[PDB]
Design a binder for these strands. Structure first.
Lengths: 35, 91, 335, 225, 415, 30, 166, 137
RNA sequence: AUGUGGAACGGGGUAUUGUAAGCAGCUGCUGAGAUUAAGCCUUUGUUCCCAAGAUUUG
RNA sequence: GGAAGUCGGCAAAAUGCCACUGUCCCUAUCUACUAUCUAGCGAAACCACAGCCUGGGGAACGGGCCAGGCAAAAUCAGCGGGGCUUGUGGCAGUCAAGCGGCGACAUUGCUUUCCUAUCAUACCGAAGCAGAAUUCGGUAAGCGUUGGACCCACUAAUAGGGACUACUGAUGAAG
RNA sequence: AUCAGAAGAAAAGGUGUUAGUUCAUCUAGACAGCAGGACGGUGGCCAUGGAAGUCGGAAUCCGCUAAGGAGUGUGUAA
């Protein structure tokens, strides 16, 4: 089993955070922010 | 069997590698500063790395080679990957 | 055995859960709040369509236990600026508003009745007659300070409780520049910030509270805890008679169960429906914060469509959601 | 004929249903299974991506023909509402409040003749005739009551246990007015209904079925033209 | 007989190092003079016992994994004598067993003597005297372990010939067109070069015909290679498919090939011989044809024709030796089979997947295929409940008229 | 320490090192 | 796969592209690797390398030396052999055969122990047949009744290694 | 042989049948009783008697049955359960009697027709049992 | 330390139980009746209490 | 679920091979009493002096010595804690680096916490390692190492070893 | 000195460093680095499917020489 402390699990976790996966968190806060 | 797909971005300072050995992991590398990667047409499916600093060009050539290493297979039979062919100068 | 990460197992030195960490500030993002403060009214259960690909009940109905906490809109009553120092963050200055309501003034006394109610008299007096000192202090914050945290207090008056001392805490302000935070803070003095403008019904927040005191078994319970990855299902408005009505239910109803929430009361304010358990018993103030980190696990991204919410009688074995339906089914009583 | 598997399971008679008018496949699992069915019947009959009672075994949980489809009482109102919306008008859909809920394991039907697990209730027999518009015979295959799973049947043929006697095959074929074959599938898997799904023009079998059986089904069900 | 499952043999030095390293690492190490003599005795006996178990465990693995020449099918048994000299292999396998008991006896002896150890040193030397002896016992089989490893190395390379299934053995003179037939029939790639003895050993290849699998086992031409070919033909239920160089382009006289076929006829007895006339496009033949068993099939080796016909003839010889109106839709009669190349094939849900995120990410729109009057409402949510009552129980296409036929009635009751 | 052992030899070692050195010298003399 | 399938693959597809470079560099740097291995390693693995390097050094010295030459409780606590038997003689300590090596012939011969002649330790040991160092023992030499002297310690070695008195 | 050929994956559910428990034979293979001796897929939980549930595989001995099926411990699938278990739908289920079927390690059951109700879970996991099931609720 | 103050009852809601006596001819008054905060919700219902004492505090 | 706990039907339960049972999986809840606190009454054993810890002090290394770690009143309730050694046998002859007759390797004769010396999980190098599976070796103690009478299964694996003060909670005067 | 330093393992090993001792070539060009030659009888003889110096057994000789070993390894079925 690959452990969550793995540097490559952490590396690919990063690339998920740089797709539309995080874009749906960037403008997602902008929703409230115009209110 | 599987063609190695290469995409070039930022005038060739970042390389994207696809379909290596059938893997669907996107092997992406950022070239060291002063290194430009281009795909040459005179010879099929080979890459030209141009730069001013030998250290950065050579290390970038090393980085690409070690990214696409065959794993758990045999070097004897699965001899697939990216290898450095020639080490020369612009003129 | 027992985890060693949660010792010394001793009673929490606080009642309101302390936010020991705030999300990293990024100037590319513009200004927003990062936390909130609610009261655990109780929990119910729901029925939901599950849109998780690959899950064995993709596009199938499940049943989920949800925690309902009431969050009347918090009122911003101050701004504080922390300065980076080699010895750590240090609160440089603090600025307040003019009209600090009696709810938050009670927080400054152990006996509000016997006091002379003398809190913030000189400050408010000098606030009106000479605003240059306030301008100077805000100038200091936007010139030196790097972390801007606003005093906000909850309107415990609206809650169906017996407490009257409002709760007070420091919400950090992530977004923009330090000047932008101070402008945002100054534009929200004496105004209220609503939870609809802080959380949006689908994100995944971290819940902080103090556990229910089980007693002495060393000390057991009444510990400070932090649930992570608690997902909002529905942010309801207290003004609408549809806050417990879904699109698959209609049936005009309110989130408060038949007979009022057990040992809490009737929720008539803005509320939040989190999933699963939350620390602490009912009527204990909980803290809600945005997740410290971006994790786009599919559970944190998938949308939610509640099919039906339960308002049966939690005080026993309820079997009727609304008093109208109970009358329709049961024969006409002698009354 | 085709070799196809659901996930990594050869029993595609369990995970899907197919008639002359429609095709029901499991949900949420392999959409590759939906692609397989769509590749041969996508432009001809509807291919419904459905579930019965929150399960992927809809093939063994329903029974139907080109005319009508039946579901057990365990199916939800939501799933039944889904099926009727997706399915076209000429196909009737009904809830069979019947003794043995698994309709696929007890009833194997075509457009004209159906074979049922003798242990069914009379009202179920009446509605099957009313809905399916077929003659109902309360018989058994190879001495086994599970007609639907041990007798893969279509408009142009049928397959049964290799064990059943020759006189039994002749009796079933004559009473079915159709050629019949006592064959195997999936390398000795005797659940012919659970391994083979057949319409009057196409048929699907598990990946583990060898070529000898595939030739046999091709001959009996005459898909070559 | 898949001989690939045999563990690889160490080369003595590694064998001792692996055994000794395991004893040091897995058993205790520290002891003092002041400990009770029973504990001192128990400690060193554990090492002596442990190494014996390690040595025997390794040795038994060899003795069990290797194939017992007597108990196997005489095809592979006769193949192994020509390759490996069954006596030498049996002598090698037996020596390791004599080794296996010898280590056991020494271990039993020194454990037995160690019960009388009086001081830490005297037990120390019996343990050393032990470890030396089982070390010296093993060192004597250097030739045996090396021989077995070479035998193992070549065993894993051998192809698992199929004796039970129907087979078509091919034999003849070298470079007589047998390689071309094997390449055209079997999917295996056997190197074909003008150099003689290219078929160093047997090459097995499976082929599918008449909905059945047939194993074609090409044999070396004709000596060690000739002996292997003779043994393969000796015990193998297969049809002889000898290819005769009619055009003599193989470098051998036609009379010489006929003489070789006549000599091999004793081995070809009780078999369906084939009189393949190789290089037909490119005397003794009548005598060979007089047998009758061999079927005269012309083979145009230069023109590359007749290979399929020869295979069909051989397979046939081997087989000899051994109201319901199905209203199919009109679209079915003109349906284009989905093949990926042509764009014609309508897109499939598998392809809509890969564009839209793949497995586990793409959410199939279940509502996307309802036959409905409108494709906009195609994502609407239908009411399910209202006031204790289900919406489902009331859905009636004419329900509005039941509601109007009402309105008169209540208006009657109020009046 | 920084090591896997202690550099300060306990007085037993300061005691028996010298005598065992003395026995060594006596052995060469014999 | 059949026979030398990898050899066929090498023949028909070639070896790895940089294989010669990798092996040449590996053949280039083991000199540095050996010294790094000799200086950093500690313990048994160090000691084994210590003794094996001396093996190769002495060997290479000899092969090169050959080169210019070409150019130019009452129980028995010792092994025993078979009132007077007051002590207990275990069957474990019992010894019957000995490895007697002839002096002139220089061959270690497996000979049964006919009897014990005299034990230098004490007459009781000789009477009890206690095998010790320096004890004379008579064995049958028909296949070679002759005396011999024990050149080993049967108590420790566990084998009766003796030299013929001839 | 555990979790083998069980199609998808099983949701967690309450543990009903610990080791050394008696279940009825559910199919017409010829058996009457089964005896649990071991449970597949149990970890190193100290002093935890392995327990079975619907759709689980256990090594079983035919306590009461014809001698040919006896004398050979072999896996069996627990098809029913008496302890109350909750579906992910939320409803709580329980049957009258603990029942199990006799199955080979591959997944094909050795019976020909199973008797009575079938757990909807095991019908989902095991297509072979779903092939040979009478009524599933 | 006089107020959407607090308390004691009471009403309503929610609940647990299972139809109270008596009357009339098993049936109906009777999902009645009883209990309901002691760690349930609420109260324009009635009444009272509180606009204190002691101590320690630069 | 019904002997899987335990050397085990110990004790209850079942009545006054089958069957029952909280022995166990796995404990949970409820009742009384002790218990705690308050008013009163009120001992004795014991006592050189005292009471933090690591290493060292020839021994016996200790509570006092030495070198360090450190160290902030008063208390309340629980718990009783107090330079060895290893992986490689013995006899005989042959060399022979060399030293002063030995002679080195080699040759021939016969017979709770901690440790890593890692079982599993992570990575790594080699092997006829095609794939799968596996073998050997290296870094590695983060993390697991089971359930029943040498066995018989599960399991990824079922690796080898060492050993008054403190502790746990609760108040608390004070710059 | 990736855990330097302030008689027991001990004998040995280190492409660590610094000094010495005894031998070697060296402007007839030292060592290394490079260009080139590194031959022709001869594929010497048994040995063999195929062994041409380099799977394997004895010599292992000769013409040119400034030099080419019946051959130092890799390698090729050869």
């Amino acid at each position: 089993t690959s452990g969550p402390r793995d540097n490559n699990r952490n590396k690919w976790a990063k690339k998920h955070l740089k797709k539309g996966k995080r874009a749906k968190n960037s403008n997602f806060s902008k929703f409230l922010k115009k209110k | 069997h599987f063609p190695i797909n290469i995409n070039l971005t930022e005038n060739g300072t970042v390389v994207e590698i696809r379909n290596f050995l059938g893997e669907r992991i996107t092997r992406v590398i950022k070239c060291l500063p002063g290194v430009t990667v281009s795909i040459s047409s005179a010879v099929k499916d080979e890459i030209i790395l141009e730069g001013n600093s030998l250290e950065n060009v050579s290390q970038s050539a090393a980085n690409i080679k070690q990214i696409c290493n065959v794993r758990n297979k045999d070097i004897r039979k699965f001899l697939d990957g990216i290898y450095v062919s020639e080490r020369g100068n612009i003129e | 055995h027992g985890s060693l990460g949660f010792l010394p197992r001793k009673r929490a030195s606080r009642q309101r859960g302390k936010v020991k960490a705030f999300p990293k500030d990024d100037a590319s993002k513009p200004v927003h709040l990062t936390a909130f403060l609610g009261y655990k009214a109780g929990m119910t259960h729901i029925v939901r369509d599950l849109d998780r690909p690959g899950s064995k009940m993709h596009k199938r109905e499940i049943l989920e236990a949800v925690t309902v906490i009431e969050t009347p809109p918090m009122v911003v009553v101050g701004v504080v600026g922390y300065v980076e120092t080699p010895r750590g963050l240090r609160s440089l200055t603090t600025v307040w508003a003019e009209h600090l309501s009696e709810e938050v003034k009670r927080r400054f006394y152990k006996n509000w009745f016997k006091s002379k109610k003398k809190a913030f008299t000189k400050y408010a007096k000098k606030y009106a007659e000479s605003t240059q000192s306030i301008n100077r202090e805000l100038e200091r914050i936007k010139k030196y300070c790097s972390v801007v945290r606003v005093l906000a207090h909850t309107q415990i008056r609206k809650t169906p409780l017996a407490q009257k001392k409002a709760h007070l805490m420091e919400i950090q302000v992530n977004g923009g520049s330090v000047a932008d935070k101070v402008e945002w803070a100054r534009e929200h003095f004496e105004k209220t910030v609503d939870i609809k403008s802080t959380f949006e019904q689908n994100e995944m927040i971290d819940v902080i509270g103090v556990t229910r005191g089980k007693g002495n078994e060393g000390n057991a319970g009444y510990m400070h805890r932090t649930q992570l990855n608690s997902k909002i299902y529905r942010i309801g408005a207290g003004d609408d008679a549809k806050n417990a009505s879904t699109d698959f239910d209609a049936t005009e109803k309110r989130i408060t169960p038949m007979g009022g929430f057990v040992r809490y009361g009737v929720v008539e304010n803005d509320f939040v429906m989190l999933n699963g358990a939350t620390p602490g018993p009912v009527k204990r103030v909980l803290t809600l914060r945005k997740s410290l980190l971006t994790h786009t696990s599919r559970k944190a991204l998938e949308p939610v469509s509640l099919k039906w919410i339960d308002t049966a009688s939690k005080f026993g074995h309820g079997r009727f959601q609304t008093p109208a339906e109970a009358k329709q089914f049961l024969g006409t009583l002698k009354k | 004929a085709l070799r196809a598997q659901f996930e990594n399971s050869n029993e595609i008679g369990v995970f899907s249903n197919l008639t002359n008018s429609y095709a029901l496949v499991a949900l949420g699992g392999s959409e590759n299974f939906y692609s397989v069915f769509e590749a041969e019947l996508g432009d001809v009959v509807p291919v419904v991506h459905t579930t019965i009672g929150g399960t992927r075994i809809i093939g063994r949980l329903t029974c139907g023909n080109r005319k009508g489809l039946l579901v057990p009482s365990s199916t939800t109102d939501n799933e039944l509402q889904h099926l009727r919306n997706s399915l076209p008008d000429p196909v009737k859909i009904q809830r069979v409040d019947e003794r043995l809920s698994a309709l696929g394991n007890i009833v194997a039907c075509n457009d004209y003749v159906a074979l049922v697990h003798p242990d069914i209730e009379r009202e179920t027999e009446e509605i099957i005739a009313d809905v399916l518009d077929v003659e109902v015979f309360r018989q058994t295959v190879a001495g086994n009551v599970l007609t639907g799973s041990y007798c893969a049947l279509s408009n142009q043929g049928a397959l049964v246990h290799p064990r059943t006697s020759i006189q039994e095959q002749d009796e079933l074929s004559s009473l079915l007015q159709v050629p019949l074959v006592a064959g195997t599938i999936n390398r000795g898997s005797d659940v012919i209904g659970a391994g083979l799904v057949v319409n009057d023009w196409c048929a699907f079998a598990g990946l583990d079925t060898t070529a000898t059986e595939l030739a046999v089904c091709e001959s009996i069900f005459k898909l070559q033209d | 007989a898949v001989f690939k499952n045999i563990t690889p043999i160490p080369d003595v030095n590694t064998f001792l190092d692996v055994v000794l390293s395991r004893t040091q690492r897995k058993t205790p190490t520290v002891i003092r003079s002041g400990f009770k003599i029973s504990r001192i005795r128990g400690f060193y006996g554990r090492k002596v016992k442990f190494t014996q178990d390690t040595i025997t465990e390794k040795l038994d693995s060899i003795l069990q994994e290797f194939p017992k020449l007597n108990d196997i099918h005489p095809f592979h048994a006769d193949l192994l004598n020509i390759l490996y000299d069954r006596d030498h292999l049996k002598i090698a396998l037996s020596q390791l067993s004599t080794a296996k008991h010898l280590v056991e006896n020494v271990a039993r002896d020194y454990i037995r003597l160690l019960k009388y150890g009086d001081s830490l040193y005297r037990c120390k030397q019996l343990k050393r005297a032990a470890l030396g002896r089982m070390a010296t016992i093993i060192k004597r089989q250097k030739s045996s372990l090396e021989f077995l490893e070479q035998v193992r190395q070549h065993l894993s390379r051998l192809p698992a010939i199929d004796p039970n299934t129907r087979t078509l053995l091919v034999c003849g003179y070298p470079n007589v067109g047998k390689s071309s037939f094997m390449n055209k029939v079997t999917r295996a790639q056997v190197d074909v070069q003008p150099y003689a003895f290219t078929t160093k050993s047997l090459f097995v290849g499976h082929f599918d015909y008449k909905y059945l699998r047939w194993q074609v086992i090409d044999t070396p031409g004709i000596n060690t290679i000739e002996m292997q070919s003779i043994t393969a033909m000796a015990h193998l239920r297969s049809a002889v498919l000898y290819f005769m160089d009619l055009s003599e382009m193989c470098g051998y006289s036609v009379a010489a090939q006929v003489k070789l076929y006549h000599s091999i006829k004793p081995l070809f007895a009780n078999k369906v011989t084939i009189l393949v006339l190789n290089k037909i496009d490119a005397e003794l033949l009548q005598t060979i044809i007089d047998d009758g068993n061999v079927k005269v099939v012309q083979t145009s080796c230069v023109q590359d024709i007749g290979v399929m016909d020869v295979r069909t003839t051989a397979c046939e010889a081997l087989l000899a030796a051994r109201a319901r109106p199905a209203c199919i839709p009109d679209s079915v009669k003109t349906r284009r089979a989905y093949d990926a190349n042509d764009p014609n094939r309508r897109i499939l849900a598998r392809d809509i997947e890969a564009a839209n995120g793949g497995a586990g990410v793409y959410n199939v729109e279940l509502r996307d295929k309802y036959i409905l009057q409108d494709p906009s409402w195609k994502y609407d949510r239908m009411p399910e409940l209202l006031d204790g009552k289900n919406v489902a129980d009331f859905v009636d296409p004419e329900i509005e008229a039941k509601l109007l036929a009402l309105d008169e009635e209540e208006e009657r009751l109020e009046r | 320490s920084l090591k896997k052992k202690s550099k300060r030899r306990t007085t037993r070692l300061r005691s028996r090192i010298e005598k065992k050195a003395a026995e060594s010298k006596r052995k060469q003399k014999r | 796969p059949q026979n030398e399938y990898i050899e066929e693959s090498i023949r028909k597809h070639g070896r790895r592209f940089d294989h010669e470079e990798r092996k040449r560099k590996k053949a280039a740097r083991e000199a540095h690797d050996a010294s790094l291995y000799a200086q950093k390693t500690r313990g048994i693995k160090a000691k084994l390398y210590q003794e094996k390097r001396r093996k190769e050094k002495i060997q290479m010295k000899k092969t090169i030396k050959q080169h210019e030459e070409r150019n130019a409780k009452r129980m028995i606590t010792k092994a025993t052999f078979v009132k007077y038997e007051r002590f207990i003689r275990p069957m474990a300590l019992r010894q019957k055969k000995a490895n007697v090596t002839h002096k002139e012939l220089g061959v270690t011969m497996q000979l049964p122990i006919i009897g014990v002649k005299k034990n230098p330790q004490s007459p009781t040991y000789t009477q009890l047949g206690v095998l010790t160092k320096g004890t004379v023992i008579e064995v049958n030499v028909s296949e070679l009744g002759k005396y011999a002297q024990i050149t080993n310690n049967p108590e420790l070695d566990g084998c009766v290694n003796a030299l013929l008195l001839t | 042989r555990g979790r083998g050929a069980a199609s998808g994956t099983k949701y967690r559910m309450t543990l009903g049948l610990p080791v050394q428990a008696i279940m009825n034979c559910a199919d017409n293979s010829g058996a009457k009783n089964l005896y649990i001796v071991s449970v597949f897929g149990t970890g190193a939980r100290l002093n935890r008697l392995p327990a079975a549930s619907c759709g689980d595989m256990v090594l079983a001995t035919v306590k009461k049955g014809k001698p040919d099926l006896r004398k050979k411990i072999m896996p069996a699938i627990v098809v029913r359960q008496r302890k109350a278990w909750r579906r992910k739908d939320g409803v709580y289920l329980y049957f009258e009697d603990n029942a199990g079927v006799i199955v080979n390690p591959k997944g094909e059951m050795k019976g020909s027709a199973i008797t009575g109700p079938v757990a909807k879970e095991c019908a989902d996991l095991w297509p072979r049992i779903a092939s040979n099931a009478g009524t599933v609720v």
